[PDB]
C-alpha cells in the first residue's frame, strides 16, 4: 500500500516560468514512477515513465527526474495549455496506486472578492425548506476560504461550497456557498453572514441581508 504522495497541493504560477512538483513514496522504489497529466474532464494522458524519460510525443518543455523515494517534475516555460491536474503512480509493488494531485494556475492580481449575501426565498419557505446563498465573485487566488458566520458563532456540516474553475478571461475564482436548513431552523436566528479570509480586502467584511424590504 505505497501511499505515493505529492506536493504542493496547489502550484499557482503565471505563463513562462520555472516550477517544481514533488512526488515522494511511502517506501523505496528504484525507478517506478509514471507521471500523468489530466485535463479537467477528459482522459488522463501518460506523461513520464521511469521518472526521467519523456513519453513519445510529449512536449519537451519539462522532464522530471529522481529515484528512490524522491521524484520531481520541473517546468521550464509554463504555457496556457499546461494548466491541469497532475499525478504520479508507482508501478513497482502491489497494488500500483496513483498520486493525489497538484493543480497549476496562472498568477495575477490579488483582487478582493466582490461579496454579496442573500436571504432564503419564500417559495422554499412554503415548501418546508430553507437555503441561504452567499456569493463571492471575481477574486484571486483560490486561497480564499469562507467562514459562515451565524450570529456570534458558527457551525459545520450545513455548508456546501461550490467553486467554478479558473475563469477564461478574467482568470479569477468565482464561488458560492449554500447553507441548507429545515423549515423550522430558519426561525431560530437572523444573523447570517459570510466572511472571507483572503488577502483581498484588508479586513473581512460582513454583508447584510434584505429581510424587511423584500
Amino acid at each position: 500500500d505505497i501511499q505515493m504522495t505529492q506536493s504542493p497541493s496547489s502550484l499557482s504560477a503565471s505563463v513562462g516560468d520555472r516550477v517544481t512538483i514533488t512526488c515522494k513514496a511511502s517506501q523505496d522504489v528504484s525507478i517506478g514512477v509514471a507521471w500523468y497529466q489530466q485535463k479537467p474532464g477528459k482522459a488522463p494522458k501518460l506523461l513520464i515513465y521511469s521518472a526521467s524519460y519523456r513519453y513519445t510525443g510529449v512536449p519537451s518543455r519539462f522532464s522530471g527526474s529522481g529515484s528512490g523515494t524522491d521524484f520531481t517534475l520541473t517546468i521550464s516555460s509554463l504555457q496556457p495549455e499546461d494548466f491541469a491536474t497532475y499525478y504520479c503512480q508507482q508501478y513497482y509493488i502491489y497494488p500500483y496506486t496513483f498520486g493525489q494531485g497538484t493543480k497549476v494556475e496562472i498568477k495575477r492580481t490579488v483582487a478582493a472578492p466582490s461579496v454579496f449575501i442573500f436571504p432564503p426565498s419564500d417559495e422554499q419557505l412554503k415548501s418546508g425548506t430553507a437555503s441561504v446563498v452567499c456569493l463571492l465573485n471575481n477574486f484571486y487566488p483560490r486561497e480564499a476560504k469562507v467562514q459562515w458566520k451565524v450570529d456570534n458563532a458558527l457551525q459545520s456540516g450545513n455548508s456546501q461550497e461550490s467553486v467554478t474553475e479558473q475563469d477564461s478571461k478574467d482568470s479569477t475564482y468565482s464561488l458560492s456557498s449554500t447553507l441548507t436548513l429545515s423549515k423550522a431552523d430558519y426561525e431560530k436566528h437572523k444573523v447570517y453572514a459570510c466572511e472571507v479570509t483572503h488577502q483581498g480586502l484588508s479586513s473581512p467584511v460582513t454583508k447584510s441581508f434584505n429581510r424587511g424590504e423584500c
Binding site: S114, F116, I117, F118, S121, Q124, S127, S131
Partner: peptide
C-alpha cells in the same frame, strides 16, 4: 427539478453591479 429565485434588492447589490440568480434543487 425544482426551480427557485434569487432576485436581489436595491440593497442586495454593490455599486453599479447587480447579482441575480436561480437555484435548481
Amino acid at each position: 427539478p425544482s426551480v427557485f429565485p434569487l432576485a436581489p434588492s436595491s440593497k442586495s447589490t454593490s455599486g453599479g453591479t447587480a447579482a441575480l440568480g436561480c437555484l435548481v434543487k
